[PDB]
């Protein structure tokens, strides 16, 4: 009989950096997703497994809600089969993804005059992430043959960079909050 706590993920006051994206596990509750989809407050609401107005009518063993912040131009990377710094190095959806991608502009909350430098993303990585891999490493990146031994320098880079979110950014460079719902003995139903 109990309601899935989608509010505390969508309405959380603080969101994770994309490289350290948060995962919430929705289990043992009832979910009304047409209330999310009827919100009409999301610039992105693309579902990949089955119709969004037709998903209040199904059951799943486990629902995962992943959430993070990225820049606007990068929201398109949060979809199956994409490439780029986010999809390759930060958060990677599988090619056979079934689920929904929801996003909205968060310029009012996550940008600051002077620039908000708290949101970070992974800039350097030797190889692409597997689907749903979370790399929280801050080891210095070795771009040449000499080991870095924890010292930044030539061929030795800190692997993370911060988005400088300012409210005068173009919308492509403004912060967007993203929630990814993936659908995995039923525990959650409509």
């Amino acid at each position: 009989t109990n309601l899935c706590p989608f509010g505390e993920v969508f309405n959380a006051t603080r969101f994770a950096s994309v490289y350290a994206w948060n995962r919430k596990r929705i289990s043992n509750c009832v979910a009304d997703y047409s209330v999310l989809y009827n919100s009409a407050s999301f610039s992105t609401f693309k579902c990949y497994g089955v119709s969004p107005t037709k998903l209040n009518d199904l059951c799943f063993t486990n629902v995962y809600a992943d959430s993070f912040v990225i820049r606007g131009d990068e929201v398109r990377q949060i979809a199956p089969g994409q490439t780029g710094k986010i999809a390759d190095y930060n958060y990677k959806l599988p090619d056979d993804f079934t689920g929904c991608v929801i996003a909205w502009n968060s310029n009012n909350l996550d940008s600051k005059v002077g620039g908000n430098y708290n949101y970070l993303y992974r800039l350097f990585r030797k190889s692409n992430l597997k689907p749903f891999e979370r790399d929280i490493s801050t080891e210095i990146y070795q771009a040449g043959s000499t080991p870095c031994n924890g010292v930044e320098g030539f061929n030795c880079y800190f692997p993370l960079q911060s988005y400088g979110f300012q409210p005068t950014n173009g919308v492509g460079y403004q912060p967007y909050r993203v929630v990814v719902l993936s659908f995995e003995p039923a525990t959650v139903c409509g």
Partner: antibody
Amino acid sequence: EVQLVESGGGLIQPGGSLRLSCAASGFTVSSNYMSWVRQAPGKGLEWVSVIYSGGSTYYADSVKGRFTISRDNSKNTLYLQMNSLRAEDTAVYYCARDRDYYGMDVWGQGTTVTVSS
Amino acid sequence: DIQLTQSPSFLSASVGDRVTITCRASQGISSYLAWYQQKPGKAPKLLIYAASTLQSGVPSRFSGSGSGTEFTLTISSLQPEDFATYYCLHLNSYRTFGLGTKVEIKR
């Protein structure tokens, strides 16, 4: 030392194809972002293509569908395969090590490509 | 498609002057901008990245400054070897150079 040397440029006819090579020293090509940049006679720099260390590739609209960037880790060498060349592809071609946010710090001396009937 | 416009295309000045080169973005792009120098017949050189960060080993008279929509590159006291062309560049899944600014000797 640190070095990029680009070879393979020469004269080729419109519609033909040509492969450029860029041999690096002092950093690991497959570990880095790598760009090709070109400059037509008397004109500005034009970015051409980039390869990510993880293998993703991107192209300027003016070469999309015709150029392919790639690398060979065992030769520490970067390649640009150029098909369906056109006269306006005539330029000096440079490769650079690309630090992304941090900019392109290491450049080659360039190789010249001439496309003409 | 953000458009970069660099101005002026030609700038005449003399040794010791303070020169200011501007790059204007059609939309606020934060710090996603870099500056390059090119001397004739030679490869580009990186000067500044992330708008205001001076690349290592580049003389301190070079400095950059940017709001998001207006970026300038400032040579505080022009040296004889600073006569050259300067290009601004914007990036993210692509790289785009500005048309360039040629700094020439005033007379």
